[PDB]
Design a protein around this nucleic acid. Sequence first.
DNA 1: CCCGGACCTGTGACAAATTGCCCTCAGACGG
DNA 2: GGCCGTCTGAGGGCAATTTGTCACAGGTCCG
Length: 214
Amino acid sequence: NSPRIVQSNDLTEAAYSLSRDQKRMLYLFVDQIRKSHDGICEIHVAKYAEIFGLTSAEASKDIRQALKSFAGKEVVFYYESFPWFIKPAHSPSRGLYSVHINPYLIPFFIGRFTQFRLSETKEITNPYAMRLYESLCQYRKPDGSGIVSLKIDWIIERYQLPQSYQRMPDFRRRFLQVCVNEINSRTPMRLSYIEKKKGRQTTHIVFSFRDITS
DNA sequence: CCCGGACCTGTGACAAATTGCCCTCAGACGG
DNA sequence: GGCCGTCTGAGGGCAATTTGTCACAGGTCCG
Ligand SMILES: Cn1cc(NC(=O)c2cc(NC(=O)CNC(=N)N)cn2C)cc1C(=O)NCCC(=N)N
Ligand SMILES: [Mg+2]
Ligand SMILES: [Mg+2]
Ligand SMILES: [Mg+2]
Ligand SMILES: [Mg+2]
Ligand SMILES: [Mg+2]
């Protein structure tokens, strides 16, 4: 069926802040690179629109604004920091974009690895829920189930959650609860969780999941 | 004992940003 | 050959929802 994205666990666990539309482009770049050094990639408006069910106009809007917002963004591997792009994007032909990814990032893309089909994620809206759905895939078994314990401090550092989510009731209300409900509504995964406490503080969240093909 | 204080939880308000939509008009191409 | 009819996509916008922030109500234990 649809394209199988694979990526090193190091990218899954990196520190960065990207919007939904930017994460969408990033999945296709990883796809192009892996099918091969170069680092020069390309995107056609009319193809983006068909994959994610957008019109050409709104696709054009999404590519263009995503693209100018990469400037100044950095990626951290735990630590080491890199820029995503080393030259501005540019369009040689109408309906075509050309981009220059940092060639030092190549080895981090292809390595202890993570994998999922693109149709699983293309309806998620909140970028933090994409981050969470990836980090769960890293632990999945062939049959489609898994269980993992993530530390709350590590979630805040790695997903670069905004500062007010250090108050636990806001963390619950605006990130944890909402994102477990997108995954349950928009992917083929069925997800549950429970809180681990130490004294008054909640320190970890323990996730279990299965696949709805069983 | 009960105080003020340092922790924790949940909800009500308001501000800022993102969503899918809508309209204009010229570029690229072929009949 | 060259104009025009169509398919694209590069611009300009919108209101309704969602995300980020902080005040206040209401629980416990410490000294
Ligand atoms: C379905 N839908 C989702 C939204 N909004 C969102 O999904 C949305 C809004 C935001 N906002 C933010 O990031 C907030 N950030 C911030 N205040 N600092 C993030 N997302 C993912 C709006 C509507 C919608 O249908 N709007 C159009 C309604 C209409 N005018 N007919
Ligand atoms: Mg959009
Ligand atoms: Mg009293
Ligand atoms: Mg008093
Ligand atoms: Mg009351
Ligand atoms: Mg009180």
